[PDB]
């Protein structure tokens, strides 16, 4: 039951170093193998390196061993990736793993990385507002760089909530929305909320749904 | 240098069925083959590792085997909880690589959409772009047909759509059709609607609203 946690920058300017750290609850890394992993948006995964915390070796994948670095602090039982001029390609989930042998056992969570050098911008809210069953949604527009998280009422609403993929858009911005249906006799007793969480901006925007 | 390759790349399956996935090493890698599910949004999960024995807690209608150096995970009677990208993995030696993965997706009985259309807010109109979402709610099969007419005549540039992952419980997907304009265009006509024709409705439905009224 040993957890890790992935921790970084999620975003980028290209050529700069990608840094990130893996914080390990309930485990040692000076015993077994830990290993960084990526999986770029709607792709799949590819091994970027190891090391072994019994003898400190390391081990990287050619086709980036070149730019990748690994560090380890025992002291804050953590290890980093250092991953040095980055480009669009490198744009990817980047996971944190603990090996006994050749095999991922335990996984972090993961952590998105975007690298472009298009500012920050936090997102617009606009309500969506309209039989037996009504929807209500959300629109959340002009961000950058994913991901916003979406909830209805303070995450007590979440049947029949559906929060789209985001679509970058012709203006270099994502967008989405975020829909929730809900019996049309509820409309005039139970008030609707969505709570929109943009961390790369640190914004937070609460917009309540009205029918007018 | 070992290159895996994973067929096939995707896969429609019902409840009950038997799926067989395999994987291709270009070298002989020595049993050494895990097996991985990934849900999505989730990080990996490992089923089985040397390239028969099963992690600890895996349902034993998950298998594998091996021919030579062909590779296989099979799922003898397919199971709600199963849909999942599986991926295939080598540690015979560095550097570790991975198959392309397998989308695996659940067939279900025809669903009709729900459909709902959402006029722009005036915070919205006075933001200079205006946004119109037309929703499609709760359906299946994945294909589906959504038109904008704006004061009845077809309009077939300014839209894109976006479709959820398969529902977990209904099996179902849900659609958004998204019609931008700028806030001049959109005071320039009437009505606004959405035309959806799908293979559970008998005809096509239409949602519509009157800007400004």
């Known amino acids: 039951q040993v957890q890790l946690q992935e921790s970084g920058p999620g975003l980028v300017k290209p050529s700069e170093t990608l840094s990130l750290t893996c914080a390990v609850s309930?485990?040692?890394?000076?015993?077994?193998?830990w290993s960084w992993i990526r999986q770029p948006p709607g792709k799949g995964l590819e091994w970027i390196g190891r090391?072994?915390?019994?003898?400190?070796?390391?081990d990287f994948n050619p086709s980036l061993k070149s730019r990748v670095t690994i560090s380890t602090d025992t002291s804050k039982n953590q290890f980093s990736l250092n991953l040095r001029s980055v480009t669009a390609a490198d744009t990817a989930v980047y996971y944190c793993?603990?090996?006994?042998?050749?095999?991922?056992?335990?996984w972090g969570q993961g952590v998105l990385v975007t690298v472009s050098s298009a500012s920050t911008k936090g997102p617009s809210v606009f309500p969506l507002a309209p039989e037996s069953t009504a929807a209500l949604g959300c629109l959340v527009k002009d961000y950058f760089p994913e991901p916003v998280t979406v909830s209805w009422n303070s995450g007590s609403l979440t049947s029949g909530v559906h929060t789209f993929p985001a679509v970058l858009q012709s203006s270099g911005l994502y967008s989405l929305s975020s829909v929730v249906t809900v019996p049309s006799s509820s409309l005039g007793t139970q008030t609707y909320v969505c709570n929109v969480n943009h961390k790369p901006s640190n914004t937070k925007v609460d917009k309540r749904v009205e029918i007018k | 240098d070992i290159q895996m390759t994973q067929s096939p790349s995707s896969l429609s399956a019902s409840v009950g069925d038997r799926v067989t996935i395999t994987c291709r090493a270009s070298?002989?890698?020595?049993?050494?083959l895990s097996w991985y599910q990934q849900k999505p949004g989730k990080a990996p999960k490992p089923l089985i590792y040397?390239?028969?024995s099963l992690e600890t807690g895996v349902p034993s209608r998950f298998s594998g085997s091996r021919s030579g150096t062909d590779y296989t995970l099979t799922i003898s009677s397919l199971q709600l909880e199963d849909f999942a990208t599986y991926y295939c993995?080598?540690?015979?030696?560095?550097?570790?690589?991975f198959g392309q993965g397998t989308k695996v997706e659940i067939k279900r009985t025809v669903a009709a959409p729900s459909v709902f259309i959402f006029p722009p807010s005036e915070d919205q109109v006075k933001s200079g772009t205006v946004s119109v979402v037309c929703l499609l709610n709760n359906f299946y099969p994945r294909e589906a047909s959504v038109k904008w007419k704006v004061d009845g005549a077809l309009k077939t540039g300014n839209s894109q759509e976006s479709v959820t992952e398969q529902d977990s419980k209904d099996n179902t997907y849900s659609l958004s059709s998204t019609l931008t304009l700028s806030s001049t265009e959109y005071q320039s006509h009437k009505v606004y609607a959405c035309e959806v024709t799908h293979q559970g409705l008998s005809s096509p439905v239409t949602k519509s609203f009157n800007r400004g009224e």
């Open positions: 793993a603990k090996t006994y042998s050749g095999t991922f056992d335990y």
């Open positions: 090391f072994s915390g019994s003898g400190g070796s390391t």
């Open positions: 993995q080598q540690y015979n030696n560095s550097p570790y690589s």
């Open positions: 309930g485990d040692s890394i000076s015993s077994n193998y």
């Open positions: 070298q002989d890698i020595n049993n050494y």
């Open positions: 040397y390239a028969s």
